[PDB]
A paper describes a structure:
This complex is composed of the iron-sulfur scaffold protein ISCU2, the dimeric pyridoxal phosphate (PLP)-dependent cysteine desulfurase subcomplex NFS1-ISD11-ACP1, the allosteric regulator frataxin (FXN), and the electron donor ferredoxin-2 (FDX2), which is itself reduced by the NADPH-dependent ferredoxin reductase (FDXR). The sulfane sulfur (S0) of the persulfide on ISCU2 is reduced to sulfide (S2-) by FDX2 to initiate [2Fe-2S] cluster formation.
First, to elucidate the interaction site of reduced FDX2 with the (NIAU)2 complex, the (NIA)2 subcomplex was incubated for 20 min with iron-loaded ISCU2 and FDXR-reduced FDX2 to yield the (NIAUF)2 sample. In the (NIAUF)2 dataset, 61% of the particles belong to a class in which FDX2 is bound in the proximal conformation, and 39% belong to a distal-bound FDX2 class. In the distal conformation, fewer salt bridges are formed with NFS1’ than in the proximal conformation and the overall resolution of FDX2 is lower than for the rest of the complex, indicating a more flexible binding mode in the distal position than in the proximal conformation, where FDX2 appears well resolved. A possible explanation for the existence of two binding modes for FDX2 could be that the distal conformation is kinetically favored and represents a first stage of binding, which then enables the intrinsically disordered C terminus of FDX2 to rigidify and transiently bind to NFS1.
Numbering used by the authors:
A (entry chain B), G (entry chain F): 5 to 85
B (entry chain C), I (entry chain G): 3 to 76
C (entry chain H), H (entry chain D): 35 to 158
D (entry chain I): 69 to 171
E (entry chain E), F (entry chain A): 56 to 455
The structure:
C-alpha cells in the first residue's frame, strides 16, 4: 500500500499549501508532516487502513475549508512580507 | 544559474550542508531522505520552477542528476 | 416513531364497527385519564365460546391507534378467558412504548375488559 | 420659605438641617457639615453627590436630565431612589424629605 | 427525500445573506470585541457596533438602547426579573396575560415564589385582552406590564400602542415580547410607548443562540443584572459578546427591514390560499384566534374528531406542530387554547401551520392535499365522527 | 498587513475542522432540536446528543452530566448562584480565592449582598493556594468551594485533585472553573473528585457564544435554575439549544482529545524558546507565577521600568494584552498581580503572551525581536531607568 | 442600461438556478424576477445606477452561497420528485 | 490609538536629560511609579527670560508620552509667564484624549509647573 | 418533435394559450413579452435543449421561427 500512501501524502500537502490563512496553512503542513512521520513504522494492515481512511476524511475537510477560505479571504500577515 | 538553485533547494530540503550534494549522489542511498522527504523535495522543485511534473517523471527523479536533467530540459 | 406503531397505523387491521343490535357482540368505549384518547373496541363470538371477529375505532394519538389495532389482532382467535389475560405490559412490550406512552396501552387493556364485560352482560 | 430636611450620614446618625427654597442639597450639606463631596462642583461629571431620596418625596422631584442619568448609572450602589444632590432644589413640596448618603 | 418545512414559529432557516455576512468573522476576524489593545479587537468591536445600529434602525431606537443576549428567553428573564428586583422597595406587583410564552410565565411564577404578586389577565375568546380589564388590574404598587406582540401559538396581535398609552398614563413600565413580531409587522418603540422589548435571532432568519433586549434610556428604565461578571453591555449582561452571532443578527434585521412589505404581501396571499382551500374541502374545521387581528404567517386550525398527533403522524412529509397533550413531554394540555375558551376535544385537534419567507405555493398546495386526504382517512377511523354522523351529541354521551 | 495574533487567552481562532462540522447545520439542518414531531427536530436532537457525548468523553463524564450554556460566564453563574441558593436553608457560606475570574468573583459579591457569607482565600507569591488555609477556612455552614484550574492571567495551576479530596472529606461541593484548562491539560472529573466544572467554547478553538457546565449525578448535586422557561436541558437551563454552536463545541472537544499531547509538547517547546530568548537579551525581566505549577501557553512577564501600555502601543504588529490600570477603561490595576504580591511598579509593567494551537516558531522569533528592541527604546526613554542606572533606589525617592 | 441590465438579469438568474437547496433556489428566482418587474419604470439615472450596484452585490452573495451550498448539500425534498 | 499620540511616540522629538548642576536649568519630576505615570520635564533658560532647550523622560502609556512630548514642544520658545499659561485642557484638546486619559494632560501640566517652580526657587 | 416542444416551451413561458404561437409571431410585437420575459424564455430553451447559446445568437432569437431554426440546427 506504499503507492497509495505516497499519493495521498502528496495530495494532502499540495492541498494544504493552498490555504489562504497563514495560521491554517502552516498548521496543516506541519501536522501532516508530523503525523505521517509518526506512523512510518506501523505494521498492522488494519491500523494502516484505519489511518488511510482518517487521512481521506482529513483531506476532504481540507478541500472544503481551503475553498471556503478562498471565498472569504483577508490581507496577509506582517510576517508574510 | 539552474545548477546552484537546484543544489540549494536540495540542500535546504534534505539538510546536506551544501557540501554533500553532488552530481552523482542519490536522494535515498547517499543522502539521508526517505520517500516522505523526496515527495516534498519534488514539490519544492515544482514550486521554485513552475512546472507540473507528472507522476511518472516524479518517480523517475531519484537522484540529484535526474532532477538537474529534468529542470534543465524543462 | 417506532417501527411497529408506524406499521399499525399505516396498515389497517380491523378498523370498523359491528352491529350492536346483534346479541353475539360486546362493545367497549373507554377514555384516557388525562388526555383526549378514546377507543371503541368491539368483539364478536360465534355459537361456541370463540371470538371470530373484532373491530376498533380510535380517536387518539398514533400510539393509541397502534395499541387498539394490536389489541384487536390479539383478541381475534381467543376465547373470553384467554383474552382476559391480556395486560397493558404486554402491549407496551410489543410496541416498545416510552414512559410517556403507557396511557395508550392501559386504555387498550381497559377497552378489552369493557368489551368482555359488555358481552357477558348482554349474553346474560 | 423655610424647608426642613434630614441628612443621614453613613453611620446612620440623623442630622436635621434647616434650609430655604431655591437652594442646592449638596451645598446645604456642605454648610451644615455633612460628608457630601461635590467633587466635580455640580458640573455633572463625578457621582460623589450621590444621595438616596425618601420614598414619599421622590416623585415630587423633577425628572433627572440625560447627563444626570448618565452619571447615575455609573454611580456605585445604585438604587431606585437615587438622585444627585447637586440637582435637587428645595421646594415647599420637599418638607420632611430625608437624604441618605450612600456607603 | 426530506419533508417540507412548515414550522417557522419554532425556528427559521438561516438567510443566505445572513450567512454571507457571518462567515468572514468565522474565518478571519476572530478577535475578542472587548480586546482594547489590538486590531483584531478593534475590528470586532466595530462590527458589533454596526450590528447594534442595524437592530436599533429596524425597531426605531437609539443604538445605545440595545443589549445583546443569548436569545429571547434570556431577554424576557432580564426584562421581567430585572425590573421587578430593581424596583422592589416600592413596587411589588406585576401584570401579564394568560397566553404569554412560558419564559415570561415561568419568570412570573418564580417571582411569585420570591415574594411578588402577579396578576394574570384573561383574554377574550378572540385571544385579545380587554383594555378595560387592564386598566382595572393596575394598582398603585404595580411595577411592570408584559404583553406579547404576536402570539406564537395562534398568531393574534395585541393592541400594543393602546396598552403602551395606558401604561404611560398610569406610570407603569411596559414590556413586550416581540420575538414573533420583529421583522414581520411594523414596530416603533417611540410610537407604541414601549419600555422593554425582547428580540430573537432565529425567529427572523438569523442564527440561533443570540438575541437582544431594548431598554429605554429617556425616561431611563433600569434593571438589576442577572448574569454577574466583567461589566460588558453597560453592566446589564456580562460575558463575551459573540461577534459572529451579533453580526448575523444585525444582518437579519437589515434584511427584514428591506424585505418586510414584500414578505407580508406574499405571506398574506399564501395564507389566504391555505385557509380557503382547507375550508372549501373539509367540514367542521375551525380557526383558533380572531382573523381581524391576526398575523397571517401563523395559522392554527382544529380538525374536529381527529387527534392532532395522529394527523401529524399521517403527514409524515410535512413538518408541522400540534397543541395536542399527546405531543408534550409532560402530557401538558395547551394553556393558550384553554385560555381562549376552546373545548378540550377541539384543543386536542389543533394543528399549527407556519408560512414564512421561503415557503412556496407548491408546498402550500401539497400540504392542503395531504391534509384533506389524511383527515378524511382519520375521520373514517374515529368513533367521535361515527357518533356525530350517526345523529348523536358528544356532550350527552357518558364518558369514562 | 495584519498583525500577528498572540492573545489566545482572550479568545481562539476557529478550528477549520470545527467550522467544517458546523456548516451543515448552518445550511441544511436548521430544525429546532426541541421539535419532537418531525425529522428536522429529530436530526437536530441527534446532533445535540452526539455533541454532548463528545464533551463528556473529553472530561471523563457520563453524557447526562453535561448541560450546554452560552459560555463560561453563564456556567460560573449557574454553578455558584444555583448551588448556593438551592442549599441556602442549611449552608450560607462559600469559599473562593482572590485570584479567580471576575464572573466567579462578581457572583460571589452578589450572593454576599443576598445574605451569604463569603471567604476570599489569599494565594502565595507563586499564585497557588495553601491547603492548610483551605482546610482551616471550612465551616459546618460551608456550601461551596470554587477554585479555578488554570489562571487566565498568569497561568498557574492549582492542586485540583487534592482540593477535591479535601472537599469530599469535609462533605462540601467542589466547583472548578476550567475554561483555561479544557483541552489543554488532562482532566478527569472522577479522579479529581470534581462536583461542578465550567467549560467555554471559544477558549478551545470552538465557536463563540457557547459553553457547558458539568454537574455530577452520583452523588447528585442540585442547582436552582437561573433562566426560567420551558424546562430544556433537564430544567437547569431553559431556552432553545443552539444546535450549530453545540455541534461546534463537541467537534472542538473531540479535536482537543485527539490533539492534546502533540499540542502540549509543541507549546512547551515554543514557550521555553520565548522565555529563554527574552531573558537571554533583556536584564530585569521577571515571570509572574511559579514555573513548577505553570501552563506553558500563558506567559506573563514584567519589563521593569517600562509601562505595559507603552510597550503594547510600541508593538503595533503583535496582538497581546497587559495588566495595567492604564489599559483598563476603569483604570483598575491587576488584582491577580496584586494578590500574588507584585510591586505596584511592576504590575503596570506586565505583558501577557499567548501560545496556542496555531503559533509558529517564526511568529515567536518575530515577537521576541520586536519586544527586545522596543523595551530597549522605552528604557532609554524612562526616567525610572535613568535613576536606576544612576545609582538610585526607587523606594527611597519621594514621589508626589 | 438596456444591455447591461439584461446581462445582469441573465447572470443573476443563471446563478440562482444552481442553488442546491429548494427553498433558496425558488426564493432567489422569484425575488429577482419580482424586483426587476418592480423597477422597470425607473427614470432617474442615479437611482438606476444604485439599483445596478445593489444587484451586483447580490450577485456576489449568490455566487458565494451557491458554492458553499454545493460543498454542503443534502437530500432533495419530497416535492421535487 | 490616536494618530497624534502614535506619531509622538514613533517620532521622538526631545527625549533626553540636562545637567542638574547648571544654574540655568529647571527640573520637573511628577507622578509616582505606584500610580503608573512618571514624567521628567526639563527646561533651559538663557541669559534673558526665554526658554531655549527642553528635554523629557516619561514612564507611562502612549498618551502620557505624547503629553510630555507636546508639553516640551509647546514650552520651548516661550518665557516663564507664557509657559505658566499652558493648561491640561489645551493638551487634551490637541491630542483628542478621552476622559479616562485626562490624567496624562493634568500630569504634563503639573510637570511644567513643577519645572518652572524649581527654576525660580533655584534661581533665587 | 422539435416543433411541438419549442411551441410548448414558448406557450408555457409567455402564456399564449398554445394557440397564438405561430411560425411568424414575434416575441415582443405579436405576443405580450418584454425583454425580462425574453431572457427567461431563452433560458428555458437552453434548459430544455442542452445548448450554451451565445449572446450573439440569443439576441438574434427574436421570433418563434428564429428559435425553431436555431434549435433544429443545433
Ligand atoms: P517510504 O520511505 O517508502 O515510506 C513511505 C511510507 C510511510 C508509506 C512507508 O514508510 C510505509 O509503507 N510505512 C508503513 C505504514 C504506513 O504507511 N503508515 C502511514 C499511514 S497513513 C498516515 O499516517 C495518515 C496520517 C493522517 C493525516 C492527518 C493530518 C491531517 C490534519 C488535519 C488538520 C487540518
Ligand atoms: P426590456 O423591455 O428591454 O426592459 C428591460 C429593462 C429593465 C432594461 C428596461 O425596462 C429599462 O431600461 N428600464 C429602465 C429601468 C431599469 O433598467 N431597471 C432595472 C434596474 S436594476 C434593478 O432593478 C435590479 C434589482 C435588484 C435585484 C435584487 C434581487 C435580490 C435577490 C437576493 C437573493 C438572496
Ligand atoms: S457634584 Fe459632581 S456630579 Fe453632582
Ligand atoms: Fe395518547
Ligand atoms: Fe497613565
Amino acid at each position: 500500500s506504499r503507492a497509495q500512501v505516497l499519493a495521498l501524502y502528496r495530495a494532502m500537502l499540495r492541498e494544504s499549501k493552498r490555504f489562504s490563512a497563514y495560521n491554517y496553512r502552516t498548521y496543516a503542513v506541519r501536522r501532516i508532516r508530523d503525523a505521517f512521520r509518526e506512523n512510518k513504522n506501523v505494521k498492522d494492515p488494519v491500523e494502516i487502513q484505519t489511518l488511510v481512511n482518517k487521512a481521506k476524511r482529513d483531506l476532504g475537510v481540507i478541500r472544503r475549508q481551503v475553498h471556503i477560505g478562498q471565498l472569504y479571504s483577508t490581507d496577509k500577515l506582517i510576517i508574510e512580507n | 544559474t539552474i545548477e546552484e538553485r537546484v543544489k540549494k533547494i536540495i540542500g535546504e530540503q534534505l539538510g546536506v550542508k551544501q557540501e554533500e550534494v553532488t552530481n552523482n549522489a542519490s536522494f535515498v542511498e547517499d543522502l539521508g531522505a526517505d520517500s516522505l522527504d523526496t515527495v516534498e523535495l519534488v514539490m519544492a522543485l515544482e514550486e521554485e520552477f513552475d512546472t507540473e511534473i507528472p507522476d511518472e517523471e516524479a518517480e523517475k527523479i531519484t537522484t540529484v542528476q535526474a532532477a538537474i536533467d529534468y529542470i534543465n530540459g524543462h | 416513531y417506532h417501527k411497529k406503531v408506524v406499521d399499525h397505523y399505516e396498515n389497517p387491521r380491523n378498523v370498523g364497527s359491528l352491529d350492536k343490535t346483534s346479541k353475539n357482540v360486546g362493545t367497549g368505549l373507554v377514555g384516557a385519564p388525562a388526555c383526549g384518547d378514546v377507543m371503541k373496541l368491539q368483539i364478536q363470538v360465534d355459537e361456541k365460546g370463540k371470538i371470530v371477529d373484532a373491530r376498533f375505532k380510535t380517536f387518539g394519538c398514533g400510539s393509541a391507534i397502534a395499541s387498539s389495532s394490536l389489541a384487536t389482532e390479539w383478541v381475534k382467535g381467543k376465547t373470553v378467558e384467554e383474552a382476559l389475560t391480556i395486560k397493558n405490559t404486554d402491549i407496551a412490550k410489543e410496541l416498545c412504548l416510552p414512559p410517556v406512552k403507557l396511557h395508550c396501552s392501559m386504555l387498550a387493556e381497559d377497552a378489552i375488559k369493557a368489551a368482555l364485560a359488555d358481552y357477558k352482560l348482554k349474553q346474560e | 420659605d423655610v424647608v426642613n430636611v434630614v441628612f443621614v450620614d453613613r453611620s446612620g446618625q440623623r442630622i436635621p438641617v434647616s434650609g430655604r427654597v431655591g437652594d442646592n442639597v449638596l451645598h446645604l450639606a456642605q454648610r451644615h457639615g455633612v460628608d457630601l463631596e461635590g467633587a466635580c462642583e455640580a458640573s455633572l461629571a463625578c457621582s460623589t453627590c450621590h444621595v438616596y431620596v425618601s420614598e414619599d418625596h421622590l416623585d415630587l422631584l423633577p425628572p433627572p436630565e440625560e447627563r444626570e442619568d448618565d452619571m447615575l448609572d455609573m454611580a456605585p450602589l445604585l438604587q431606585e431612589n437615587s438622585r444627585l444632590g447637586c440637582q435637587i432644589v428645595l421646594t415647599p413640596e420637599l418638607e420632611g424629605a430625608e437624604f441618605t448618603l450612600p456607603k | 427525500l426530506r419533508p417540507l418545512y412548515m414550522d417557522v414559529q419554532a425556528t427559521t432557516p438561516l438567510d443566505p445573506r445572513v450567512l454571507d455576512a457571518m462567515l468572514p468573522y468565522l474565518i478571519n476576524y476572530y478577535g475578542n470585541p472587548h480586546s482594547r489593545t489590538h486590531a483584531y479587537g478593534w475590528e470586532s468591536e466595530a462590527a458589533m457596533e454596526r450590528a447594534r445600529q442595524q437592530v436599533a434602525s429596524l425597531i426605531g431606537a437609539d443604538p445605545r438602547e440595545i443589549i445583546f443576549t443569548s436569545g429571547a428567553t434570556e431577554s424576557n428573564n432580564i426584562a421581567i426579573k430585572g425590573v421587578a428586583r430593581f424596583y422592589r422597595s416600592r413596587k411589588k406587583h406585576l401584570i401579564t396575560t394568560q397566553t404569554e410564552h412560558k419564559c415570561v410565565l415561568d419568570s412570573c411564577r418564580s417571582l411569585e415564589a420570591e415574594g411578588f404578586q402577579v396578576t394574570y389577565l384573561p383574554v377574550q375568546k378572540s385571544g385579545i385582552i380587554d383594555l378595560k380589564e387592564l386598566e382595572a388590574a393596575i394598582q398603585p404598587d404595580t411595577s411592570l406590564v408584559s404583553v406579547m406582540t404576536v402570539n406564537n401559538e395562534i398568531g393574534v396581535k395585541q393592541p400594543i400602542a393602546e396598552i403602551g398609552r395606558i401604561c404611560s398614563s398610569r406610570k407603569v413600565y411596559f414590556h413586550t415580547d416581540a420575538a414573533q413580531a420583529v421583522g414581520k409587522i411594523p414596530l416603533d418603540v417611540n410610537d407604541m410607548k414601549i419600555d422593554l422589548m425582547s428580540i430573537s435571532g432565529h425567529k427572523i432568519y438569523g442564527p440561533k443562540g443570540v438575541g437582544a433586549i431594548y431598554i429605554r434610556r429617556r425616561p431611563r428604565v433600569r434593571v438589576e443584572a442577572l448574569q454577574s461578571g466583567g461589566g460588558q453591555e453597560r453592566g446589564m449582561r456580562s460575558g463575551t459578546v459573540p461577534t459572529p452571532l451579533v453580526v448575523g443578527l444585525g444582518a437579519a434585521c437589515e434584511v427584514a427591514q428591506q424585505e418586510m412589505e414584500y414578505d407580508h404581501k406574499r405571506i398574506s396571499k399564501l395564507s389566504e390560499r391555505l385557509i380557503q382551500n382547507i375550508m372549501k374541502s373539509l367540514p367542521d374545521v375551525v380557526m383558533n384566534g380572531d382573523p381581524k387581528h391576526h398575523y397571517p404567517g401563523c395559522i392554527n386550525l382544529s380538525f374536529a374528531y381527529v387527534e392532532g398527533e395522529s394527523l401529524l403522524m399521517a403527514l409524515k412529509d410535512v413538518a408541522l406542530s400540534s397543541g395536542s397533550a399527546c405531543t408534550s413531554a409532560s402530557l401538558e394540555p395547551s394553556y393558550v387554547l384553554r385560555a381562549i375558551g376552546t373545548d378540550e376535544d377541539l384543543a386536542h385537534s389543533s394543528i399549527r401551520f407556519g408560512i414564512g419567507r421561503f415557503t412556496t405555493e407548491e408546498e402550500v398546495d401539497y400540504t392542503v392535499e395531504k391534509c384533506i386526504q389524511h383527515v378524511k382517512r382519520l375521520r373514517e377511523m374515529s368513533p367521535l365522527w361515527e357518533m356525530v354522523q350517526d345523529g348523536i351529541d358528544l356532550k350527552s354521551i357518558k364518558w369514562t
